[PDB]
Coordinates of C-alpha atoms (C1' of nucleotides) in Angstrom, one line a residue:
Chain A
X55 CA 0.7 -56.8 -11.2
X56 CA 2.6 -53.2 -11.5
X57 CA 4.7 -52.2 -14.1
X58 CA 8.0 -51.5 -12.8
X59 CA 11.4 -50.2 -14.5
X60 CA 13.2 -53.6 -14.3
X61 CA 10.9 -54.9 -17.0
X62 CA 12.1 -53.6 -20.3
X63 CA 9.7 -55.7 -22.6
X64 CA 6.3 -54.3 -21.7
X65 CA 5.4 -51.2 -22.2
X66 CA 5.2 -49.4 -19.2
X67 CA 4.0 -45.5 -19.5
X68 CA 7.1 -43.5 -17.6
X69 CA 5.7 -40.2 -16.3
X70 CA 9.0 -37.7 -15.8
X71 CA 8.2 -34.6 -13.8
X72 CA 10.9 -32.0 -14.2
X73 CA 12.5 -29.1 -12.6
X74 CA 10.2 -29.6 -9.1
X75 CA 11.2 -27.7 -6.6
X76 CA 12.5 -29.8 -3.5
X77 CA 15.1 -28.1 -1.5
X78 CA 16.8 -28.5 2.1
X79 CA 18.0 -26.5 4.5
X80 CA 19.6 -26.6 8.1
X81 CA 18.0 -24.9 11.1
X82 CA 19.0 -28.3 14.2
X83 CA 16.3 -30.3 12.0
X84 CA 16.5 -30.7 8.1
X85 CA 13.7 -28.7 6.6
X86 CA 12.3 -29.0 3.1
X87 CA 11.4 -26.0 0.4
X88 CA 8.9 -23.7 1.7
X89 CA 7.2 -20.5 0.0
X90 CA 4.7 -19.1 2.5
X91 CA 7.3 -20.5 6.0
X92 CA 10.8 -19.4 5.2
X93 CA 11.4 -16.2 3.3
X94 CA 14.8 -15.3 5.0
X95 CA 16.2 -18.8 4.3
X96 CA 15.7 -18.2 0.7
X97 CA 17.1 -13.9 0.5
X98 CA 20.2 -15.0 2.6
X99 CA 21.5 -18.6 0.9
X100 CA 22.4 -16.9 -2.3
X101 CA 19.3 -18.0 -4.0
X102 CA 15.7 -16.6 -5.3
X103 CA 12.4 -16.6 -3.6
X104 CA 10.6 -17.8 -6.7
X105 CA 12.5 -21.2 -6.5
X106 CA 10.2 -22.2 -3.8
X107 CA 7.3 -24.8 -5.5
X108 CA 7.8 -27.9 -3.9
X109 CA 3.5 -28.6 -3.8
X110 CA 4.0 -29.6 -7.9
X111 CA 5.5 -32.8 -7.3
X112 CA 2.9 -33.9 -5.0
X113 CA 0.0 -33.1 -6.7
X114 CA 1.3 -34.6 -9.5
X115 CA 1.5 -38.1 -6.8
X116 CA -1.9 -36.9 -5.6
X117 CA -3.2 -36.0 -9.1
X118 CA -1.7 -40.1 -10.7
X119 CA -2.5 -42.1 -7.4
X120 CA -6.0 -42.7 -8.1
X121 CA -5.9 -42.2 -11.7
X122 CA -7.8 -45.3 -13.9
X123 CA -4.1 -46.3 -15.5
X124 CA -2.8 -45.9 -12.1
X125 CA -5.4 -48.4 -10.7
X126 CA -4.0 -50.9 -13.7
X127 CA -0.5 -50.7 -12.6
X128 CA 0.9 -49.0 -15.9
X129 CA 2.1 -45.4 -14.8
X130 CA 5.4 -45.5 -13.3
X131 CA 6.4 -42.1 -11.7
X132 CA 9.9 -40.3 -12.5
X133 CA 11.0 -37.5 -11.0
X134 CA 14.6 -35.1 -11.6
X135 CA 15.1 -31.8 -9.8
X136 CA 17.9 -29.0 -9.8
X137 CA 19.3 -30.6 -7.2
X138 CA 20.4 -33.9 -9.0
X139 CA 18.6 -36.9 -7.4
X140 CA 15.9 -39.1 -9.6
X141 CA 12.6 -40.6 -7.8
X142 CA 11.1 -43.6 -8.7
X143 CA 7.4 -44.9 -7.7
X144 CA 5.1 -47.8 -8.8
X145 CA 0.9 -47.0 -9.7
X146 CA 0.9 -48.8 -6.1
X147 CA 2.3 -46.8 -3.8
X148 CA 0.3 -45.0 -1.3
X149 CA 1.0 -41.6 0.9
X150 CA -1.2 -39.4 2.9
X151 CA -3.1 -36.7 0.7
X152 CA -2.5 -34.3 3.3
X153 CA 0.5 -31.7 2.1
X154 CA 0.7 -31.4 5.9
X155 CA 0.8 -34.9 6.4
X156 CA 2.9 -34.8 3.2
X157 CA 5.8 -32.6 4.4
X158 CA 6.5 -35.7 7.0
X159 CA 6.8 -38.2 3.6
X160 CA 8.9 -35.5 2.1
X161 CA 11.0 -34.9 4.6
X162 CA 11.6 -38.7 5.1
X163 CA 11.8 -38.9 1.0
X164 CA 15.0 -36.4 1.5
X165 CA 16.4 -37.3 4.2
X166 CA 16.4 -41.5 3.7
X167 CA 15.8 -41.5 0.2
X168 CA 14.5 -45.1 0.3
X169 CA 10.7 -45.4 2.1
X170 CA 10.0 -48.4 3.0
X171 CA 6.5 -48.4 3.1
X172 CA 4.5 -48.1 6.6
X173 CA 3.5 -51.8 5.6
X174 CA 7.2 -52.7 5.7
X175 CA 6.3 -55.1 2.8
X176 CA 7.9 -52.6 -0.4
X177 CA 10.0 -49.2 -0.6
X178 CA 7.4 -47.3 -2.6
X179 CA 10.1 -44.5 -3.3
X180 CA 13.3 -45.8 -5.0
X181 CA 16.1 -43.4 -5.3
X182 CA 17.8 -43.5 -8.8
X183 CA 20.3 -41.0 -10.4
X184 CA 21.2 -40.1 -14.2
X185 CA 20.2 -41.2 -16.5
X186 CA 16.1 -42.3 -16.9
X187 CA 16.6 -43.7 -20.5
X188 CA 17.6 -47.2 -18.4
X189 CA 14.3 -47.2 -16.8
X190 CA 12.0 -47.3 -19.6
X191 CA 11.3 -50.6 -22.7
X192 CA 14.2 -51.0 -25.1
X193 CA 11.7 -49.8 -27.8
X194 CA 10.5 -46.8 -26.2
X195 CA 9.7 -43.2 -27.6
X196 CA 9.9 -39.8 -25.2
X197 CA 7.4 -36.7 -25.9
X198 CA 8.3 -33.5 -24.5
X199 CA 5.6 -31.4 -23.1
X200 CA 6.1 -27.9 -25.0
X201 CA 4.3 -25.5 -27.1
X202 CA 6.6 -25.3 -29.9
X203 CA 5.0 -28.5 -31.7
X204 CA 1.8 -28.5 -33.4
X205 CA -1.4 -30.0 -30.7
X206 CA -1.9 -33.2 -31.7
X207 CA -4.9 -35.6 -30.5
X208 CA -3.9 -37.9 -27.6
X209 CA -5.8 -40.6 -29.0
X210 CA -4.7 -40.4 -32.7
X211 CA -1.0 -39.9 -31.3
X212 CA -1.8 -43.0 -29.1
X213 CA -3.5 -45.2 -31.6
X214 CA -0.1 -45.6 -33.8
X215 CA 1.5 -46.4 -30.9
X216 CA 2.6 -49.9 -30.7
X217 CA 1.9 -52.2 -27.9
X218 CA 5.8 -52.8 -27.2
X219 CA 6.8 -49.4 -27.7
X220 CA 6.8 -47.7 -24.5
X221 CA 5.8 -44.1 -23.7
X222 CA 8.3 -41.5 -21.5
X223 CA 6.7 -38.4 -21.3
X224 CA 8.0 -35.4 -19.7
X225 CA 5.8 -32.8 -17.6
X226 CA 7.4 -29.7 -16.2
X227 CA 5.9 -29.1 -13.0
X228 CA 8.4 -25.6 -12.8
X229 CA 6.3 -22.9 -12.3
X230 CA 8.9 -20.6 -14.5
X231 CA 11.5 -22.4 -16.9
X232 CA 11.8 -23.4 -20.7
X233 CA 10.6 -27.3 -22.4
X234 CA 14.3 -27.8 -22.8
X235 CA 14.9 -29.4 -19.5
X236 CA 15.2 -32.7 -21.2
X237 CA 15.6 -31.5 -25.1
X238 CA 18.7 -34.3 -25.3
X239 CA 16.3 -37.1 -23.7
X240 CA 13.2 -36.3 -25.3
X241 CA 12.8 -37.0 -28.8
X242 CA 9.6 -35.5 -29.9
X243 CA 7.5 -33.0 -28.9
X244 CA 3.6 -32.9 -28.2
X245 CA 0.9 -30.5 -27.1
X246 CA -2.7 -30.8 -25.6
X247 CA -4.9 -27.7 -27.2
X248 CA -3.9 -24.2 -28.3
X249 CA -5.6 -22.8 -25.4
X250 CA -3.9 -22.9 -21.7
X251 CA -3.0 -26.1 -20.0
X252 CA -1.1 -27.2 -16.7
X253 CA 1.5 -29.9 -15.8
X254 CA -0.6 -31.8 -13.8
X255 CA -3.7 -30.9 -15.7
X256 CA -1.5 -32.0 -18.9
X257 CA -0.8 -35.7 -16.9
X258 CA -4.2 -35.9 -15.8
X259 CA -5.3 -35.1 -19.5
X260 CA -2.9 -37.9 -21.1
X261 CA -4.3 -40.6 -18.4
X262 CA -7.6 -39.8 -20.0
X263 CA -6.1 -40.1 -23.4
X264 CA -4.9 -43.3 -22.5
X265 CA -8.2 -44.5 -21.0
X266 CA -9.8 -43.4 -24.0
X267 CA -6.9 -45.2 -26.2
X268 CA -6.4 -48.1 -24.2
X269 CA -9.7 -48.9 -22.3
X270 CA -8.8 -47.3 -18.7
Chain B
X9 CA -8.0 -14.4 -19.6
X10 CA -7.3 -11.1 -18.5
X11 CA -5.7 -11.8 -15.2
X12 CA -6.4 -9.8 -11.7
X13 CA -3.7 -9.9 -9.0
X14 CA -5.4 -11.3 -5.7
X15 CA -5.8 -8.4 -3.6
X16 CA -5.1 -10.5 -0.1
X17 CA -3.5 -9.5 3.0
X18 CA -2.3 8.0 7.5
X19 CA -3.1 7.8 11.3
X20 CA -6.1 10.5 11.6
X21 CA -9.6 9.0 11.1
X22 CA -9.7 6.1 13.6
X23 CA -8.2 8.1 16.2
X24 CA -11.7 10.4 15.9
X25 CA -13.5 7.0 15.7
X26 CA -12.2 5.3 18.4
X27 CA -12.2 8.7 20.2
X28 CA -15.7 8.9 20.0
X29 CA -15.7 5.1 21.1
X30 CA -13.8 6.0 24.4
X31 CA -16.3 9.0 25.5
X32 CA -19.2 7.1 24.9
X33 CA -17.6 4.3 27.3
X34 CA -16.2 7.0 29.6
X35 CA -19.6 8.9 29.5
X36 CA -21.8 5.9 30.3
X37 CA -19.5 4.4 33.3
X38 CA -19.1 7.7 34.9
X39 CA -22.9 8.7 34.6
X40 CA -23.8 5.6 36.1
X41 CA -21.0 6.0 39.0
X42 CA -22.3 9.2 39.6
X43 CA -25.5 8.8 39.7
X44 CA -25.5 5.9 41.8
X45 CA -23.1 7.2 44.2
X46 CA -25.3 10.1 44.7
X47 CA -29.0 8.3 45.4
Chain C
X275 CA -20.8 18.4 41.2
X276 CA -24.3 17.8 41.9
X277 CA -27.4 16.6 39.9
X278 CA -30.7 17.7 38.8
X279 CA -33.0 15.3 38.5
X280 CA -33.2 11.2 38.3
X281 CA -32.5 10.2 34.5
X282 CA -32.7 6.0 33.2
X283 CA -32.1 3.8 36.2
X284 CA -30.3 0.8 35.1
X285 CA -31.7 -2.5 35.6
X286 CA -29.9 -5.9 36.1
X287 CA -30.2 -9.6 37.1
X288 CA -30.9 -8.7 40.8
X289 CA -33.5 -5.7 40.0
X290 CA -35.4 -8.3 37.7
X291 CA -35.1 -10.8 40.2
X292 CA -36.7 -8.8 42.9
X293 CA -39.5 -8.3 40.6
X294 CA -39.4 -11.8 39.6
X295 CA -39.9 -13.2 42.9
X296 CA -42.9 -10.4 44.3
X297 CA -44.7 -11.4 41.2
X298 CA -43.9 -14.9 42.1
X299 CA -45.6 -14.2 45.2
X300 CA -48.1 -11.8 43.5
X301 CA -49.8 -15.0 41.1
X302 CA -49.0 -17.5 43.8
X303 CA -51.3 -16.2 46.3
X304 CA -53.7 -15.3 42.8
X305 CA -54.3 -11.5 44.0
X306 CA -55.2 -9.7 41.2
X307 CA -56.1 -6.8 39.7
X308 CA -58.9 -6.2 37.8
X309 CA -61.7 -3.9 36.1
X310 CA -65.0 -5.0 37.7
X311 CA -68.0 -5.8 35.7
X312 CA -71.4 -3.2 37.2
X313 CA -74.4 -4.7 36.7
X314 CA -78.0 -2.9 35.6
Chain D
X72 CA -23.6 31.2 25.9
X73 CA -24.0 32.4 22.3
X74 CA -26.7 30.8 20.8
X75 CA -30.5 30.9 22.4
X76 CA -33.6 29.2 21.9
X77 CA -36.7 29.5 24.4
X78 CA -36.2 27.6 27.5
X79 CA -32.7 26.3 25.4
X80 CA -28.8 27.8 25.1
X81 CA -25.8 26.8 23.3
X82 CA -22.9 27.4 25.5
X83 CA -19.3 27.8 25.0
X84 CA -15.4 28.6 26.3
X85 CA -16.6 26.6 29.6
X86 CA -15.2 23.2 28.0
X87 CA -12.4 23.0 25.2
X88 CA -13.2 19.0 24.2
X89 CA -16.5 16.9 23.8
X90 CA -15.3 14.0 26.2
X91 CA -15.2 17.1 29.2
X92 CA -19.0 17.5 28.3
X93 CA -19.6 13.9 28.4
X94 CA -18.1 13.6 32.1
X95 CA -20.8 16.1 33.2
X96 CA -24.0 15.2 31.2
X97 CA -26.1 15.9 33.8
X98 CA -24.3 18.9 36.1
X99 CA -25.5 22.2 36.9
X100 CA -25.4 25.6 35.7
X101 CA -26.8 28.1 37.3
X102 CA -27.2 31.9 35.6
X103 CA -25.0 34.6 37.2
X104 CA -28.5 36.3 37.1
X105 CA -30.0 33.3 39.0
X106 CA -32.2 30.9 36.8
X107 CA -31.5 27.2 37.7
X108 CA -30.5 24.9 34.6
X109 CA -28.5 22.1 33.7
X110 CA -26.4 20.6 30.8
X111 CA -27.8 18.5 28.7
X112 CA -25.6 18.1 25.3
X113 CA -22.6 17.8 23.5
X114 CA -22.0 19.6 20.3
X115 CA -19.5 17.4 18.0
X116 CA -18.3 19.6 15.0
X117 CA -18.1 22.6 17.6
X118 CA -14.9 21.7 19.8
X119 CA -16.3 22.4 22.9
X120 CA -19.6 24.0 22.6
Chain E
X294 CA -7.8 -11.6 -31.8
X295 CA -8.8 -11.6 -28.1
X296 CA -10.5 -14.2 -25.2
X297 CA -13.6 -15.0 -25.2
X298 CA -15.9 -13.3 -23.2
X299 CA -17.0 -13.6 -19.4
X300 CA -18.4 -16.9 -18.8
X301 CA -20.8 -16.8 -15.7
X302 CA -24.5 -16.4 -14.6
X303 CA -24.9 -13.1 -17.3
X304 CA -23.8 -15.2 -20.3
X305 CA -26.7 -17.2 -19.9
X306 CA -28.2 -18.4 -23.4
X307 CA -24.6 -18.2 -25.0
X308 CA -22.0 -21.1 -24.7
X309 CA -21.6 -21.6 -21.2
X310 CA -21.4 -24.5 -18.7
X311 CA -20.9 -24.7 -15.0
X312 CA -18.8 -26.9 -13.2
X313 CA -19.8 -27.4 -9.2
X314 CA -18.2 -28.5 -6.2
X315 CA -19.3 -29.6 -3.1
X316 CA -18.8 -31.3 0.0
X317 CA -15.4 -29.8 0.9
X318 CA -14.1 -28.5 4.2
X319 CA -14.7 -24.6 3.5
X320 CA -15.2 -22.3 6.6
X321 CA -14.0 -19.6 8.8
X322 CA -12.4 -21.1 12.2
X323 CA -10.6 -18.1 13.8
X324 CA -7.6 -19.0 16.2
X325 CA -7.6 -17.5 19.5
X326 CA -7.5 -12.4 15.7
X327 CA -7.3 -13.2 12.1
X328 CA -9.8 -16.3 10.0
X329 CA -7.9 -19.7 9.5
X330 CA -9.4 -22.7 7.7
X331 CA -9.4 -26.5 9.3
X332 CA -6.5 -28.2 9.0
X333 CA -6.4 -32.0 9.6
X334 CA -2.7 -32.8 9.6
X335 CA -1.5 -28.8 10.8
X336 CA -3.8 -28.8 14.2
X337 CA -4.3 -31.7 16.8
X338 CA -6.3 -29.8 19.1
X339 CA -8.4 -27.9 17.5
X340 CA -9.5 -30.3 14.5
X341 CA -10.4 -33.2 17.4
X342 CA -11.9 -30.2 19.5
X343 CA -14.3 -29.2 16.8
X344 CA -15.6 -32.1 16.0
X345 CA -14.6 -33.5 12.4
X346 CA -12.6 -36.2 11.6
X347 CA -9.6 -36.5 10.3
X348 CA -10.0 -38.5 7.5
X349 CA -13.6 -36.5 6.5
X350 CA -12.7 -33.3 6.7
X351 CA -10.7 -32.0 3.7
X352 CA -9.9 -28.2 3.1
X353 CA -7.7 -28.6 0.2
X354 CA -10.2 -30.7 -2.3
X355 CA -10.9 -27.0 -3.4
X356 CA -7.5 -26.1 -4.0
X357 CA -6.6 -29.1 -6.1
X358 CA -9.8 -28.5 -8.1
X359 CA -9.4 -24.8 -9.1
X360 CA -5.8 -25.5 -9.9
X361 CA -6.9 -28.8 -11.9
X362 CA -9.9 -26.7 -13.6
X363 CA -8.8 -23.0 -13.5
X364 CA -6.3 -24.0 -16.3
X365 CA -8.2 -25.7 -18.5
X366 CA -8.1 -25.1 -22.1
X367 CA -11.9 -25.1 -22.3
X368 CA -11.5 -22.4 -20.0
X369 CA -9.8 -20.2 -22.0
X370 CA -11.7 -20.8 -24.7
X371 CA -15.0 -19.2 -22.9
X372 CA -17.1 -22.1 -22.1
X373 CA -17.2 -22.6 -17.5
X374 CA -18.1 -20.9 -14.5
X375 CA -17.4 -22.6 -11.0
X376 CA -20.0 -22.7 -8.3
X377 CA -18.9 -24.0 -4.9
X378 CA -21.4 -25.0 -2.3
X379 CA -19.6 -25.0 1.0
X380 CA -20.3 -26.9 4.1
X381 CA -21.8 -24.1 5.9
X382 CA -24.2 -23.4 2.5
X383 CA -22.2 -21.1 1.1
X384 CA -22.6 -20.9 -2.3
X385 CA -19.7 -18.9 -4.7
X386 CA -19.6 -18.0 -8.5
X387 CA -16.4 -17.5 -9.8
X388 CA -15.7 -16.6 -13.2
X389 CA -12.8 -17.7 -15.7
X390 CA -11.3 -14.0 -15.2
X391 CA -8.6 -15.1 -13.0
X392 CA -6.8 -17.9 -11.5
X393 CA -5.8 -19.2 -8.2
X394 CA -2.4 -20.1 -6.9
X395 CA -1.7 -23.8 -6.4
X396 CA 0.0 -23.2 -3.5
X397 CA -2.0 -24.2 -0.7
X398 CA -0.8 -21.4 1.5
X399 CA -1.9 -18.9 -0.8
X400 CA -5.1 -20.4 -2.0
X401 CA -5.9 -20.7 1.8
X402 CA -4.8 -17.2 2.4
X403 CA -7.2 -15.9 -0.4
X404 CA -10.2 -18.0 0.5
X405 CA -9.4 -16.8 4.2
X406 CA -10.1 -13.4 2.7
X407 CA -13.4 -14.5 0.7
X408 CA -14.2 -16.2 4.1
X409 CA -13.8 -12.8 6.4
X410 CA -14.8 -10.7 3.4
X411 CA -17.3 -12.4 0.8
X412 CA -15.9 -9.6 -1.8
X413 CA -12.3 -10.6 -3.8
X414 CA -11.3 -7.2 -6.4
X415 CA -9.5 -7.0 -9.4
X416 CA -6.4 -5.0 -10.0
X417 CA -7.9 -3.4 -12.7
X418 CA -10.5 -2.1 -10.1
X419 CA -13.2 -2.7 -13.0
X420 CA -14.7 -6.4 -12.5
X421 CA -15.1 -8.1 -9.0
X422 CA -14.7 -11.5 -10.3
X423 CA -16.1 -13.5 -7.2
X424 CA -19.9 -13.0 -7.8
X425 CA -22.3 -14.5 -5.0
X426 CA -26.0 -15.4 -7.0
X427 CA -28.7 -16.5 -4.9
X428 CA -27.9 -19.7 -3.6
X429 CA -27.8 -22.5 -4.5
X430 CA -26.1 -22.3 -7.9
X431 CA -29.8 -23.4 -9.8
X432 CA -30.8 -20.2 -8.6
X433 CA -29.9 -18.0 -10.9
X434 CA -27.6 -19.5 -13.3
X435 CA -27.9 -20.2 -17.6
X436 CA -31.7 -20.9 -18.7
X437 CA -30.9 -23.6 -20.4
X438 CA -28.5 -26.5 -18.5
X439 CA -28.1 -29.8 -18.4
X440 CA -27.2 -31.5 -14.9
X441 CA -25.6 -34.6 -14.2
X442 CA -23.6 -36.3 -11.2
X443 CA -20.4 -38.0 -13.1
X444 CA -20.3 -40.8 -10.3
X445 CA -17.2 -43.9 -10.4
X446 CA -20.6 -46.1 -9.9
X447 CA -23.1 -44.6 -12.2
X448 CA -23.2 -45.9 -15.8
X449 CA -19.6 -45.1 -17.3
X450 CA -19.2 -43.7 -20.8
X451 CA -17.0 -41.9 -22.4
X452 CA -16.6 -38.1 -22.3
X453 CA -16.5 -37.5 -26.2
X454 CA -19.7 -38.9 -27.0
X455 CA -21.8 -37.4 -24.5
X456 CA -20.6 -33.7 -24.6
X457 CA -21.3 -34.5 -28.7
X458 CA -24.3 -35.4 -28.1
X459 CA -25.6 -31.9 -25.9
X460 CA -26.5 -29.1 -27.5
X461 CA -24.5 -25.6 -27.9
X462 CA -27.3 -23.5 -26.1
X463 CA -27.1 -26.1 -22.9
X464 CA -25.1 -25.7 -20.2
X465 CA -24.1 -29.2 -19.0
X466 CA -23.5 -29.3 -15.0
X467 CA -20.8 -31.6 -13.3
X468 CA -20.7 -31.9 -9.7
X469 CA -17.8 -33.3 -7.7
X470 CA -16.8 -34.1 -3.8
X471 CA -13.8 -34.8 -2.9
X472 CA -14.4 -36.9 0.3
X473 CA -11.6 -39.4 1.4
X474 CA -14.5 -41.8 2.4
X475 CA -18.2 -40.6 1.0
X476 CA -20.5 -40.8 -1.9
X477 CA -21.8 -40.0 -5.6
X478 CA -25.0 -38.3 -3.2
X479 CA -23.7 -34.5 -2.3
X480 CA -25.4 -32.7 -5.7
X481 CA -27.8 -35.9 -6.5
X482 CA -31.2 -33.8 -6.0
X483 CA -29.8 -31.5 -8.4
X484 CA -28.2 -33.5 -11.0
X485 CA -30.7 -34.6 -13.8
X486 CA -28.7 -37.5 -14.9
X487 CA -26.2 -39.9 -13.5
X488 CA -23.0 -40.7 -15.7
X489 CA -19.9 -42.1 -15.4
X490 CA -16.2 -41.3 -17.2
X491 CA -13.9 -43.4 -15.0
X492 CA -14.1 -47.3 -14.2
X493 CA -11.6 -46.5 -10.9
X494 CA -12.5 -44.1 -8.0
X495 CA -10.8 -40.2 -8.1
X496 CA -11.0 -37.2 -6.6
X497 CA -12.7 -34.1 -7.8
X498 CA -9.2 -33.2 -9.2
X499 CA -8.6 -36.1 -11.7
X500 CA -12.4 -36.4 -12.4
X501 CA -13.1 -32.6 -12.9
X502 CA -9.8 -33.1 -15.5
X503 CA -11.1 -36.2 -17.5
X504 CA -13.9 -34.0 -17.8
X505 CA -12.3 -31.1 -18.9
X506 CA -10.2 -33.0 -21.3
X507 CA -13.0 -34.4 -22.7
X508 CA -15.2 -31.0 -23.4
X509 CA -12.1 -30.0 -24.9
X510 CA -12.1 -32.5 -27.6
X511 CA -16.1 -32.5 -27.8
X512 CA -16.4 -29.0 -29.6
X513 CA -13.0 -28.3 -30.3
X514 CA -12.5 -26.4 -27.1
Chain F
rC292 C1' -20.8 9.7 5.4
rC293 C1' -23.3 10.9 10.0
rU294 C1' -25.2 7.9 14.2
rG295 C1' -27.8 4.2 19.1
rC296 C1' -25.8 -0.8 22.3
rG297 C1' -21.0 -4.0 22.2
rG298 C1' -13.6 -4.3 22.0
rC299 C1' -9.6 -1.5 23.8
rU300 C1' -7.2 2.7 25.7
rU301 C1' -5.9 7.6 26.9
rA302 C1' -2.6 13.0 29.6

RNA sequence: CCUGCGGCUUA
């Protein structure tokens, strides 16, 4: 089976990406963020050109689709942005790993909000607003990806873990912003090494952890 | 890591080069016109 | 203007093919040229 | 002219450019004197010599 | 303090290691002025006109592994080089100096450059980061390595105990392809071991991560 | 940096 957000008993790992950049605009067709097609659209709106990094959120998809704890059904996929809207996906769903390809799925993901899947069988991409707290086990504790705590071992942080208790974490997939995205959600704080690390390095690098943990 | 910026993508010099480029052409099409013409 | 002598004549497809084809001729009748071997 | 080897000058105020020469590599000039000769030659750094 | 020093082919007997990449999508195909790359997805005419498939050829396997490896915390701490052998044989040494873009656009624009170039400059104007050794990356790299495939099908283990078990004076050797349909076979001459981290199939992203994640934790790194 | 065969232009 795949762990979903409807069942609060289990513990199902939430992954929450924040402050991903997913923006549209009007030309007539709706067209999605873009850095390297539409520099005018971004110097005339009112808005920055360094706003522009909708690529995060899909390699994050890209970077948990395959993953071993993806393959097992545990990792459930959250996502808020700037503009307001909350994405929800199983470990099951599937999309072309083609950015090209991608931009269609995005597109459709911004402009329906609900895909049904090209199988017509399950809408892969469920559309869900404020707040995420509802999503996760009643017993659940959130870690917030920042530098501010000390780095702590994934597996010693996992191995006092209970089985019930579920696990939110947050990853910020901004390329500039601050760990506070979330400070009122989260309710501790982790890190991965002293040295540098990525968002989606930083998820991929917990799905080890958890493999390592929790045999995956 | 000391980071490097990617370095990714004055009108006198390639005028002489491309000058040079246009006589030679010049030079060889004439020569052979010429010389032809006048067998 | 004029000219003083006959510099580089440029060959091409047709000037090689002329010679192509005499020499066609010139191995497919087998006349050849040759140094001849004297005896005593 | 106004520089001579044997059998060999350098010639100038005829042409002001280098493309000029190379129009008429192969042309003739004949001495005032009367000697045949031709061109041969472009000098680059020299403007038109 | 400061960072560690350059890892590449010159630090050789220190701690180094080499992580490899092969089997992506990696040319020059100019439209008819300038050098683009082959997009599946972007052209319909010219990706079925050249010959590749859709679902085999894959240009951005080597974006998603230098921005899931570039970063790595290992990497700061002085420890990995990157050798890329292309589909045309083109073999490239980069060293931990710098760091790509993510963006795909970007990262396309600058191997576009390497592409029509073969020469990438610093803004310091003092250290050319992308070396070219003599190929292939065995050629010229540490003299003392350790190389093994880390296949989905070869014996899986975990990443702690292995890295452990080398020694500091080694330079242990991953190779990765990204293929949407292909095999643990691209650097198998080359490899002298087969090992396994994952018990589910990934990409050279997620794999070339795990594998990161674990050297990180193998010598504190 | 000079220079021998190949693009494009110049008055």
């Amino acid at each position: 089976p795949v762990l979903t957000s409807k069942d609060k008993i289990t513990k199902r790992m939430i992954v929450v990406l924040a402050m991903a950049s997913l923006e549209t605009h009007k030309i007539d067709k709706y067209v999605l963020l873009n850095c390297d097609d539409h520099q005018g659209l971004l110097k005339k709106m009112g808005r920055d050109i360094s706003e522009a990094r909708p690529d995060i959120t899909h390699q994050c998809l890209l970077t948990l689709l395959d993953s071993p704890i993806n393959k097992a059904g545990k990792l459930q996929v959250y996502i808020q942005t700037s503009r307001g809207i909350l994405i929800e996906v199983n470990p099951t769903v599937r999309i072309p790993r083609t950015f090209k390809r991608f931009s269609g799925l995005m597109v459709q993901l911004l402009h329906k909000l609900s895909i049904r899947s090209v199988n017509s069988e399950e809408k892969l991409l469920k559309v869900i607003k404020n707040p995420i707290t509802d999503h996760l086990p009643t017993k659940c504790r959130k870690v917030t990806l920042s530098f501010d705590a000390p780095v702590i071992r994934v597996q010693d942080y996992i191995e006092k873990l209970d089985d019930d208790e579920s696990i939110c974490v947050f990853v910020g997939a901004m390329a500039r912003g601050k760990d506070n995205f979330a400070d009122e959600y989260v309710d501790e704080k982790v890190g991965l090494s002293n040295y540098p690390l990525s968002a989606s390095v930083a998820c991929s690098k917990f799905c080890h952890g958890a493999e390592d943990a929790w045999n995956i | 890591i000391p980071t490097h910026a990617p370095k990714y993508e004055d009108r006198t010099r390639s005028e002489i080069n491309k000058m040079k480029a246009q006589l030679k052409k010049e030079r060889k099409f004439t020569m052979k016109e010429i010389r032809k013409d006048a067998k | 203007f004029d000219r003083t002598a006959k510099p580089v004549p440029v060959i091409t497809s047709e000037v090689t093919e002329s010679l192509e084809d005499m020499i066609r001729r010139r191995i497919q009748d087998s006349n050849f040229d040759d140094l001849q071997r004297r005896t005593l | 002219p106004y520089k001579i080897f044997k059998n060999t000058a350098f010639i100038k105020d005829m042409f002001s450019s280098a493309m000029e020469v190379a129009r008429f590599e192969g042309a003739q000039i004949k001495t005032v004197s009367g000697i045949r000769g031709e061109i041969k030659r472009a000098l680059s750094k020299p403007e038109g010599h």
